[PDB]
Design a protein around this nucleic acid. Structure first.
Ligand SMILES: [K+]
Ligand SMILES: [Sm+3]
Ligand SMILES: [Sm+3]
Ligand SMILES: [Sm+3]
Ligand SMILES: [Sm+3]
Ligand SMILES: [Sm+3]
Length: 341
DNA sequence: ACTCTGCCTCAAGACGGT
DNA sequence: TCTTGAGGCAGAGT
DNA sequence: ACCGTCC
């Protein structure tokens, strides 16, 4: 995302953050980042260091989490649409390689401590070596379709497509922890949305217009600010962080002017910088067309869900049947059936 | 006194009885 | 084949 | 709400 954007907004633009009870969101539509949910489920949903699976050796944690979390959201009257990632931008390749180094300095580290006998360490590095594959995304898509829950394939970054679904009024906000969703123009971002029987953090909304108001900036200047803070698509200036970049943009209003108004002896510019291409990518991303698909929450298919979850993935039939009943009853309570005119 | 580097470390769920 | 976030601290730079 | 368990 963006380096320490949430803290900056908290300290400088406190009015941009608003908190509301889960019970106030009945009847609202949200766009969820699915890949992040899958990472969460694959990391957390495990027992004894091993992930939930069937006899064929196939992971099922992502299905556990997707199923139950989705049902809970529906029970609270929240209608979600999962947005899946697409082709990553080439500007991100750099970052996409550095996150690979974090894996390189992990798999090799899972060989000396896996032979030493330290359980908890092995569990840690194993958790750090989790990667979401296409089989995960496809089994999740299948499950959602069997549940009647709509999903959309983004052409590139799912965060930008979410931002476009909000910009177009198709949903109210994007449920993601990806803060650069605000740089793609998402008028509202929602954090901490799980709706659990033992809830923890409060649901918080970041409103873009309030951010721009408190900072006294427009979308272009804000994108430049986020480029200076630390994006995933280009480099940041060495030695310039939040406090300095805020004043620099509040005073000079652009990166071009900043470069044309600084002493290179103190703050040098990165070699072969791509700040204009990142500015462009953020202001005008590759995004699906929201007017194409109209979102529908349809009746779940109970029989196929039993054959898939219980027959193939070996979930308990009682829990699944009761869950489907809960889902159909909540959808009954929150959605109006089709009216032909 | 601020502020940023540049490292280091860490983290990511839910159910059905009690 | 593709997700992210948050601190703490020594030390130099402002 | 805690805690063994989910697959
Ligand atoms: K920086
Ligand atoms: Sm992102
Ligand atoms: Sm199979
Ligand atoms: Sm190293
Ligand atoms: Sm089978
Ligand atoms: Sm009907």
């Amino acid at each position: 995302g963006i380096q320490g954007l949430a803290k900056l907004i908290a300290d400088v633009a406190p009015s941009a953050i608003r908190e509301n009870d889960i019970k106030s969101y009945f009847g609202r539509k949200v766009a969820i980042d699915a890949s992040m949910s899958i990472y969460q489920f694959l990391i957390a949903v495990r027992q004894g260091g091993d992930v939930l699976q069937n006899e064929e050796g196939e992971t099922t944690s992502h299905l556990m989490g997707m199923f139950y979390r989705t049902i809970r959201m529906m029970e609270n009257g929240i209608k979600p649409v999962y947005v899946f990632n697409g082709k990553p931008p080439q500007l991100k390749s750099g970052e996409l390689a550095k996150r690979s180094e974090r894996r390189a300095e992990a798999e090799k580290q899972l060989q000396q401590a896996q032979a030493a006998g330290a359980e908890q360490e092995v569990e840690k590095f194993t958790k750090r070596l989790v990667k979401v594959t296409k089989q995960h995304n496809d089994e999740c898509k299948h499950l959602l379709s069997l549940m009647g829950i709509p999903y959309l394939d983004a052409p590139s970054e799912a965060e930008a497509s979410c931002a476009a679904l909000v910009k177009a009024g198709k949903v109210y906000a994007a449920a993601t922890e990806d803060m650069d969703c605000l740089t793609f123009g998402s008028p509202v971002l929602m954090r901490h949305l799980t709706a659990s029987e033992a809830k923890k953090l409060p649901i918080q909304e970041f409103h873009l217009s309030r951010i721009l108001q408190e900072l006294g900036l427009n979308q272009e200047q804000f994108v430049d600010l986020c480029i200076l803070l630390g994006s995933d698509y280009c480099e940041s200036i060495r030695g310039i962080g939040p406090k300095r970049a805020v004043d620099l943009i509040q005073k000079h209003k652009s990166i071009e002017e900043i470069v044309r108004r600084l002493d290179p002896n103190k703050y040098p510019v990165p070699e072969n910088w791509l700040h204009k291409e990142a500015h462009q990518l953020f202001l005008e991303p590759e995004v699906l067309d929201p007017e194409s698909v109209e979102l529908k929450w349809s009746e779940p298919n109970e029989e196929e869900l039993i054959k898939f979850m219980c027959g193939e993935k070996q979930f308990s039939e009682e829990r699944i049947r009761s869950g489907v009943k809960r889902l159909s009853k909540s959808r009954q309570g929150s959605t109006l059936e089709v009216l032909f005119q």
